[PDB]
Short mmCIF file of C-alpha atoms (C1' of nucleotides) and ligand atoms in Angstrom, two decimals:
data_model
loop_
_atom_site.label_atom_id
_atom_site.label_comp_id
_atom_site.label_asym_id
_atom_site.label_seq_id
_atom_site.Cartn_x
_atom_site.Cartn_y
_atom_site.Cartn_z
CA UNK A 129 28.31 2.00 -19.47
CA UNK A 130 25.13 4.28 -21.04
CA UNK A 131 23.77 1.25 -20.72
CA UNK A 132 21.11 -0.56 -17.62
CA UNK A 133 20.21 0.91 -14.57
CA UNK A 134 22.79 2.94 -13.77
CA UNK A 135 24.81 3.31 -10.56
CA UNK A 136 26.30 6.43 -8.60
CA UNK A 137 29.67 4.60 -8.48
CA UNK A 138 29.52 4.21 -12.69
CA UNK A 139 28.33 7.15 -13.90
CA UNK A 140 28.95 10.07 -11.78
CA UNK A 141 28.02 12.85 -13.10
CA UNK A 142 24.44 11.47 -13.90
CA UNK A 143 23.94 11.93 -10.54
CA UNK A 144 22.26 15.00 -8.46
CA UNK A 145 22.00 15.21 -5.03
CA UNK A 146 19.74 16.56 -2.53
CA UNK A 147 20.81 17.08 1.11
CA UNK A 148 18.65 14.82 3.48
CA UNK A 149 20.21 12.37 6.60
CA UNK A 150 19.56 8.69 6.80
CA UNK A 151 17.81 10.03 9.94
CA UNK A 152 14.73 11.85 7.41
CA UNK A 153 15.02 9.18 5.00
CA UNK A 154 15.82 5.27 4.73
CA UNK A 155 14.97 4.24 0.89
CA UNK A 156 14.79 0.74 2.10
CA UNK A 157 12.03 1.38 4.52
CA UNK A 158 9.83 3.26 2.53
CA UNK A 159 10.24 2.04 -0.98
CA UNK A 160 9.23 -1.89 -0.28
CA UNK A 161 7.10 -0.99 3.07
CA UNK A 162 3.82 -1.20 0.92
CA UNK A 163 3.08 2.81 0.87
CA UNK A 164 3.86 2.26 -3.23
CA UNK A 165 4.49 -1.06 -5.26
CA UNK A 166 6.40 0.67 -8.22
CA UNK A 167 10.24 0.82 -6.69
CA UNK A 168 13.06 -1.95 -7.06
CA UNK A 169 16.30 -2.37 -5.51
CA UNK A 170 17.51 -3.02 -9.12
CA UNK A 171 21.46 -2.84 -8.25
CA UNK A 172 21.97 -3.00 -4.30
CA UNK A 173 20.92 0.19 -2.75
CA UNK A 174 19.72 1.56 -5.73
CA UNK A 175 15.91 2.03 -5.81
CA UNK A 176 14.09 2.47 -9.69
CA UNK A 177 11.00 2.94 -10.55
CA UNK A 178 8.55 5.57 -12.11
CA UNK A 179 7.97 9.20 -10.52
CA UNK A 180 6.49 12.05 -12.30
CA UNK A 181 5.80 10.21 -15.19
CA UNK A 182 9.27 9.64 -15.66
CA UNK A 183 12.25 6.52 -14.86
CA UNK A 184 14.56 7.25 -11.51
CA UNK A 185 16.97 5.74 -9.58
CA UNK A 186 17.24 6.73 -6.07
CA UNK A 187 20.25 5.79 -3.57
CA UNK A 188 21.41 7.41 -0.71
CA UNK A 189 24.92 8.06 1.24
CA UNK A 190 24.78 9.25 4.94
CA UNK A 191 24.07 13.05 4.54
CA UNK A 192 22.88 13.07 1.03
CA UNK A 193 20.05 11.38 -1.44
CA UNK A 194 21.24 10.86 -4.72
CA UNK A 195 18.81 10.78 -7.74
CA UNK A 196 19.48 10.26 -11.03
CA UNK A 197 16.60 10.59 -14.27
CA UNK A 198 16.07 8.83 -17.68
CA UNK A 199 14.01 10.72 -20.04
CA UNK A 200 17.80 13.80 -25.20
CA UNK A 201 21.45 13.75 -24.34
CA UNK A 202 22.00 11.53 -21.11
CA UNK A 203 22.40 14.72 -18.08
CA UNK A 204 21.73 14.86 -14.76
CA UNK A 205 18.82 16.11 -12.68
CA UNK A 206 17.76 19.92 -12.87
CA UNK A 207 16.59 21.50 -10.03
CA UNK A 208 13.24 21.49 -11.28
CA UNK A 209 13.01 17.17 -11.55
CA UNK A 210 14.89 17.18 -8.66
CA UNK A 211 12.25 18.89 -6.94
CA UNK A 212 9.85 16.48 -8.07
CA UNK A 213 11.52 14.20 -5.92
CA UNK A 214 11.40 16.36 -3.16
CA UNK A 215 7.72 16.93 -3.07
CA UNK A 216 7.09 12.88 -3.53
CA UNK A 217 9.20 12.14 0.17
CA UNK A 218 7.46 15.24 1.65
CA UNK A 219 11.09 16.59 2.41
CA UNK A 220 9.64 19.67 3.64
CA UNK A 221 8.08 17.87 6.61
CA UNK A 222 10.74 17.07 9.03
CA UNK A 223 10.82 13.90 10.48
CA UNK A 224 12.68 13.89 13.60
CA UNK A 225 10.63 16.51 14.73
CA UNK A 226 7.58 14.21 14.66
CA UNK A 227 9.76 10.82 15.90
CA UNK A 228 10.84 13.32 18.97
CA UNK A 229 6.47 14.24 19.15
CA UNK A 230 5.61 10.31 19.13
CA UNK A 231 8.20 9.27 21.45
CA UNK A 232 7.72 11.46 23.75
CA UNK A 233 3.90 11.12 24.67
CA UNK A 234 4.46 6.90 23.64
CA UNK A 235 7.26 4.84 25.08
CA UNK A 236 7.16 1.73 22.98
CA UNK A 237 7.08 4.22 19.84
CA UNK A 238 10.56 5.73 21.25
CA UNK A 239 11.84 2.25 21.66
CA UNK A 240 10.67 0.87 18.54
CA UNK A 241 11.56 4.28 16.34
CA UNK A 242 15.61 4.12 17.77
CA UNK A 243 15.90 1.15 15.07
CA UNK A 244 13.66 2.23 12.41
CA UNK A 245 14.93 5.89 11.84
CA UNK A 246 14.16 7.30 8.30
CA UNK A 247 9.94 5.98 7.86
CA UNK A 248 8.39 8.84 6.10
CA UNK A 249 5.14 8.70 3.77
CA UNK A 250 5.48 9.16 -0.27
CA UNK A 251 2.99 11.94 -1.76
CA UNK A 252 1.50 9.78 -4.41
CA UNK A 253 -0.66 10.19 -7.48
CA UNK A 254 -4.62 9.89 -6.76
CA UNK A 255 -4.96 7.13 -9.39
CA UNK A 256 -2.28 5.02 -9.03
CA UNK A 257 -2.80 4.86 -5.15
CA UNK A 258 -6.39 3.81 -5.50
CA UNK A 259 -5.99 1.17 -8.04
CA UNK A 260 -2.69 -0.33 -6.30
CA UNK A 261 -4.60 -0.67 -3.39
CA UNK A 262 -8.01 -1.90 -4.71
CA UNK A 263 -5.22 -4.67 -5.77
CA UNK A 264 -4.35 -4.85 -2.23
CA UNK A 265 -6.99 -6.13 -0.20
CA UNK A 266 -6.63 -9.75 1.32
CA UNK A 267 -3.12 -9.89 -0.38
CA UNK A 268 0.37 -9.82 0.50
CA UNK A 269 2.91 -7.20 -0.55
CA UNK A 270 4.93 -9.47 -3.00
CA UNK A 271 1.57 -10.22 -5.44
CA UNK A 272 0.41 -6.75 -4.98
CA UNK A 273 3.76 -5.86 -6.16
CA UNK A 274 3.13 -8.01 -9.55
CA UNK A 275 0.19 -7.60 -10.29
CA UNK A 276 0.46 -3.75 -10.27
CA UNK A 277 3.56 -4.46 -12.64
CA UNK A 278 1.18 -6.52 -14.70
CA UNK A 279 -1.38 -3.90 -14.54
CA UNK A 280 0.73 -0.95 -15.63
CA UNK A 281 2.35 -3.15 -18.78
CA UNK A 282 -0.88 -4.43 -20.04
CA UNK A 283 -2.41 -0.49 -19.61
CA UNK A 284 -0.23 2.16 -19.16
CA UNK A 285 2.01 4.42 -21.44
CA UNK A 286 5.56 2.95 -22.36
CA UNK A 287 8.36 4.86 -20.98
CA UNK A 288 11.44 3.93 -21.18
CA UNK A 289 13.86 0.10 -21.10
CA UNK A 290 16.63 -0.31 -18.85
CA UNK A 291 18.40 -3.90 -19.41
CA UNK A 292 15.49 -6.29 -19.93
CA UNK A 293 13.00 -4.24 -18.08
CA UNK A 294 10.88 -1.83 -19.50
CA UNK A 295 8.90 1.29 -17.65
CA UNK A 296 5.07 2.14 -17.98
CA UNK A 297 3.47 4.83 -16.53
CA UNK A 298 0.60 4.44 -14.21
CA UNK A 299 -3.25 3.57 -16.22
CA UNK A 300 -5.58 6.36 -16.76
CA UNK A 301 -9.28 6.06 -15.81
CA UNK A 302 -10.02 5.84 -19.69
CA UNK A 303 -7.66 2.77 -20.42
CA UNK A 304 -8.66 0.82 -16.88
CA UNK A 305 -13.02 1.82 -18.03
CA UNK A 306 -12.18 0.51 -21.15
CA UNK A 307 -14.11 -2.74 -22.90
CA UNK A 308 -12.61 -6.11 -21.88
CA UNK A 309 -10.00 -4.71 -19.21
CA UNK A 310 -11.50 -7.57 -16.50
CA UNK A 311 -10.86 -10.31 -18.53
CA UNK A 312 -7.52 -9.35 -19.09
CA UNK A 313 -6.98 -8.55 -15.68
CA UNK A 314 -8.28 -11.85 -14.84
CA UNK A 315 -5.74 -13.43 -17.39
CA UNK A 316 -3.04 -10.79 -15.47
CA UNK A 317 -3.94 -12.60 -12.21
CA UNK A 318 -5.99 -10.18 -10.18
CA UNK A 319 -8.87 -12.12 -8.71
CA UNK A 320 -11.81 -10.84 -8.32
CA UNK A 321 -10.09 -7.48 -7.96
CA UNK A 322 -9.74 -7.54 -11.48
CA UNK A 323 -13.73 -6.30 -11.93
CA UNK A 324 -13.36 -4.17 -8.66
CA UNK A 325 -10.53 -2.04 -11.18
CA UNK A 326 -12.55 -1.83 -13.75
CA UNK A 327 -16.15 -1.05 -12.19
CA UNK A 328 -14.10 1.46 -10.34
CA UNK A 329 -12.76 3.05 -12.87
CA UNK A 330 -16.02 3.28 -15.03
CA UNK A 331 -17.98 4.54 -11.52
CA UNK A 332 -15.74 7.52 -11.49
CA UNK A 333 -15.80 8.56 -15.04
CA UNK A 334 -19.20 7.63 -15.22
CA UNK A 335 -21.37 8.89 -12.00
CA UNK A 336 -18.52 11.14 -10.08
CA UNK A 337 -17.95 13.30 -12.84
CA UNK A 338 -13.92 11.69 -13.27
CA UNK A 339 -10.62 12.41 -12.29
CA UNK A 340 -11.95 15.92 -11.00
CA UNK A 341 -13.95 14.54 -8.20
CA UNK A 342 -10.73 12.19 -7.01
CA UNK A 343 -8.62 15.05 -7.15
CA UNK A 344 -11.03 17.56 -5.45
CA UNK A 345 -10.52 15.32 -2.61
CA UNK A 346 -7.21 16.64 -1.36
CA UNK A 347 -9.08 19.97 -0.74
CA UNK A 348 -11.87 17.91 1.16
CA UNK A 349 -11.76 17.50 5.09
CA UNK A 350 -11.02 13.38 6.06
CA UNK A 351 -14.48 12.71 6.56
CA UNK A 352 -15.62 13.50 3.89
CA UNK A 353 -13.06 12.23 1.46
CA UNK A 354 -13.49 8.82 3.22
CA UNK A 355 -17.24 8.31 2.83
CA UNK A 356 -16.61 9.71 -0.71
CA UNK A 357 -14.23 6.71 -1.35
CA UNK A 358 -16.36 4.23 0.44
CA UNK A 359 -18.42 4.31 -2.77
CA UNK A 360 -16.33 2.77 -5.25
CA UNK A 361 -16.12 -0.91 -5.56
CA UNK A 362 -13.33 -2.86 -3.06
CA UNK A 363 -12.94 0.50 -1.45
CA UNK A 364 -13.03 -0.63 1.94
CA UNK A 365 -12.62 1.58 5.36
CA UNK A 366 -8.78 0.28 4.92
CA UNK A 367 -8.12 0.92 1.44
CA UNK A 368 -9.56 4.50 1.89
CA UNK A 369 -7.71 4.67 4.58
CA UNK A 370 -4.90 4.12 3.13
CA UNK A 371 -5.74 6.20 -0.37
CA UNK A 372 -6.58 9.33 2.10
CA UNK A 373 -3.29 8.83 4.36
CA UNK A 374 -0.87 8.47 0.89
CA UNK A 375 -2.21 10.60 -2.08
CA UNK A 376 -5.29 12.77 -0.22
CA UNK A 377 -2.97 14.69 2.53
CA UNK A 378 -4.96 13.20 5.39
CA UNK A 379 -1.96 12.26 7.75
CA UNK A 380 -4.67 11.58 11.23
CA UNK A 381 -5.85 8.83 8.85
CA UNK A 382 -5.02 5.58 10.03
CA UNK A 383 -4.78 2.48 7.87
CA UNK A 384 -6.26 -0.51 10.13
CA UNK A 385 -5.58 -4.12 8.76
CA UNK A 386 -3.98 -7.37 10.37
CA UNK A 387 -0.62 -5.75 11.09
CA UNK A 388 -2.05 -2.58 13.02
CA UNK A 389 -4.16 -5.46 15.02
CA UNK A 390 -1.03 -7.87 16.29
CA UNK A 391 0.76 -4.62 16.92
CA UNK A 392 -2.07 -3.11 18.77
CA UNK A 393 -2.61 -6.22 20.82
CA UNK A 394 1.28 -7.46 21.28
CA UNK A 395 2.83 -4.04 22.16
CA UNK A 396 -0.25 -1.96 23.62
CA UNK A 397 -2.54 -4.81 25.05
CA UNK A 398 -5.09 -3.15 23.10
CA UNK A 399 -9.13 -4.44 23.50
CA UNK A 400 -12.12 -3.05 21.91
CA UNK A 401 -13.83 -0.96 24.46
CA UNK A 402 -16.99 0.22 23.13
CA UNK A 403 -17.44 -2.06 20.15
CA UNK A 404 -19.24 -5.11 20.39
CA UNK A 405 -17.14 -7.35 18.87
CA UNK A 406 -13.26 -9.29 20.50
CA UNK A 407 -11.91 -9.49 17.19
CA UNK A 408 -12.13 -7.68 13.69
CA UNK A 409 -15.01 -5.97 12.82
CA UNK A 410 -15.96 -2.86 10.80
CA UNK A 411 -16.97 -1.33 14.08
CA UNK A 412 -13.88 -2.71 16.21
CA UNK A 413 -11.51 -1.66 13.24
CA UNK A 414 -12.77 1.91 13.66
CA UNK A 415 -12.16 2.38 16.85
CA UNK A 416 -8.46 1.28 16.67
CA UNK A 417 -8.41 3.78 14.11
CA UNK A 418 -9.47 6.12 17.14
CA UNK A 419 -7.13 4.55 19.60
CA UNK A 420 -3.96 5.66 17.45
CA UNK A 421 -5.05 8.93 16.68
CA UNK A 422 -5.59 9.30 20.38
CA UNK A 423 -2.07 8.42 21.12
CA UNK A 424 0.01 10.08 18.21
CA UNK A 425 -2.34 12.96 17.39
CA UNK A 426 -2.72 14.60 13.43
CA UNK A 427 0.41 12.78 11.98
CA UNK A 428 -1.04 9.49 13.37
CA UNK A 429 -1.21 8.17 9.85
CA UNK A 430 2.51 8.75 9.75
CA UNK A 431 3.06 6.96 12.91
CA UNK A 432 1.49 4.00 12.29
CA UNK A 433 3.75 3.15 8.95
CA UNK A 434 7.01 2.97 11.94
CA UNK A 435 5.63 0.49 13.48
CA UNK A 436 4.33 -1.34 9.95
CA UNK A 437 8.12 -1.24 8.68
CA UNK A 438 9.24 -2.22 11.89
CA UNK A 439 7.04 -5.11 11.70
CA UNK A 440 7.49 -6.09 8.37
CA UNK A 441 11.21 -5.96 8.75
CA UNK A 442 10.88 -8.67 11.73
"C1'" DG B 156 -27.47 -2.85 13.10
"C1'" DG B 157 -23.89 -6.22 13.54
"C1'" DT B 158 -22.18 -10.81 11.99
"C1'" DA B 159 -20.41 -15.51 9.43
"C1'" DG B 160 -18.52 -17.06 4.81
"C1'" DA B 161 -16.92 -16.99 0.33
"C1'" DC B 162 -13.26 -15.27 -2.26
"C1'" DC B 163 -8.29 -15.05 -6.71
"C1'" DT B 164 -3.55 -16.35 -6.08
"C1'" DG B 165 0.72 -18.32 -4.67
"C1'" DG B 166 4.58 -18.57 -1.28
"C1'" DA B 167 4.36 -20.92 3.36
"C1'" DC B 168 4.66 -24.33 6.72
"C1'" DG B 169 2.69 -28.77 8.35
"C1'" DC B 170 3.12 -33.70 8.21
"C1'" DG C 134 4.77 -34.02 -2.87
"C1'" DC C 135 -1.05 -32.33 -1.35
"C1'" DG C 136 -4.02 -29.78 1.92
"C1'" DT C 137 -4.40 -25.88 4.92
"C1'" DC C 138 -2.93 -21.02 6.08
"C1'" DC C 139 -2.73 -16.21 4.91
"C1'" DA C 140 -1.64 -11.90 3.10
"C1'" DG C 141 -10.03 -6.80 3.22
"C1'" DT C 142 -14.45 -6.27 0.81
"C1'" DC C 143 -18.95 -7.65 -0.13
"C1'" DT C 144 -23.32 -9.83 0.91
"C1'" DA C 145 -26.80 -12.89 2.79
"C1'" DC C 146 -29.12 -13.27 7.14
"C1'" DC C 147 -30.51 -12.78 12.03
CA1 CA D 254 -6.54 -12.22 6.82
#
DNA sequence: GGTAGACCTGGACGC
DNA sequence: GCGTCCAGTCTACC
């Protein structure tokens, strides 16, 4: 009863909710789409995981999202928390205004977005959206997913245990620069990405003055936050992409990787115009960047992760 | 300046 | 069952 993940049906008035359609939000689009790696469908439509520094478990009826928080008497959200929540799904932004925007200036968007209703992008945390996706590169959503997991037991704060799994917060840059953290990585089953974390983390505590220059960032124009990135080790032009478009507030910024390409070349009959290159390059993979931004305008990052749920789901 | 290759890991087909 | 195929970044080299 008190006891695992709970469930809206078993304890009721754990539960808070917070008005917002299917049509602004679909859990199961969002959650597992690979914007974050932290959320499980624990119980059937009930997403868990760690936001705020703190356990939730999200689930959603037709008009309303329902959110529930284990932090010291068992109660249910405050407005406050639940505003937390808010702020992560960027509930002030309102999707079907920006579905009715890209469907109307891009057919196969309009036919594409009728199915997948609900795609919106999570405001994450600086940190844990560059080291997830330093663990992404030339990987597949399901690893990712574990090895983040792995990454957070082995170095971040314990939070809290429902049934047999227990909650850690996201690393800071001190545990991740600390002595040995590769090797253990490596043990963790990172790859090679397992020195890219921790050179990364030392470079930024180290030679770009810490957590202060990351931050800063959100302030910065896209440009520049994206060359900024560029320096640290398995930062890529995608997985700054991706760090600018999910925790920096750049929404024009568009994440370019094998899915963007099929897409671009299945539903748009896409070719590189004024690169050099047929296939992908860093120069080609730029200017698809441009191509989408062209077509959707400044929420083109948002855009983009339609047609990547779309595609995943398919 | 703009390429080819190598690269951790493990669920997938292919045969 | 074994080998190859895949889900971006970095570097040696033209
Ligand atoms: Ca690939």
């Amino acid at each position: 009863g008190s006891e695992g993940h709970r469930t809206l049906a078993s304890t009721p008035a754990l539960w808070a909710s917070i008005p917002c359609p299917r049509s602004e939000l679909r859990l199961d689009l969002v959650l597992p789409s690979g914007q974050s790696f932290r959320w499980r469908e624990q119980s059937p439509a009930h997403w868990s995981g760690v936001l705020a520094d703190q356990v939730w478990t999200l689930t959603q009826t037709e008009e309303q999202l329902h959110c529930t928080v284990y932090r010291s008497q068992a109660s249910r959200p405050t407005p406050d928390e639940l505003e937390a929540v808010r702020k992560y799904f960027q509930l002030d932004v309102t999707l079907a205004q920006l579905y009715h925007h890209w469907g109307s200036v891009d057919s196969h968007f309009q036919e594409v977005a009728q199915k997948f209703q609900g795609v919106r992008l999570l405001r994450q945390d600086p940190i844990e959206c560059l080291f997830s996706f330093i663990c992404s590169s030339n990987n597949n959503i399901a690893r990712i997913t574990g090895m983040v997991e792995r990454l957070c037991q082995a170095f971040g704060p314990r939070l809290i245990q429902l049934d047999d799994v227990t909650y850690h917060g996201f690393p800071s840059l001190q545990a991740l620069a600390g002595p040995e953290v590769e090797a253990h990585l490596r043990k963790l089953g990172l790859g090679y990405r397992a020195r890219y974390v921790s050179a990364s983390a030392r470079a930024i505590l180290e030679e770009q003055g810490g957590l202060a220059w990351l931050q800063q960032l959100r302030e910065s124009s896209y440009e520049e936050a994206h060359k900024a990135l560029c320096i640290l080790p398995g930062v890529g032009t995608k997985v700054a992409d991706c760090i600018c478009l999910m925790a920096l507030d750049k929404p024009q910024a568009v994440p370019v990787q094998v899915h963007m390409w099929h897409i671009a070349q299945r539903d748009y009959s896409w070719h590189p115009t004024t690169s050099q290159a047929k296939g992908p390059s860093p120069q080609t993979n730029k200017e698809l960047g441009n191509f989408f931004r062209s077509l959707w305008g400044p929420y083109a990052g948002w855009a983009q992760a339609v047609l990547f749920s779309a595609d995943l789901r398919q």
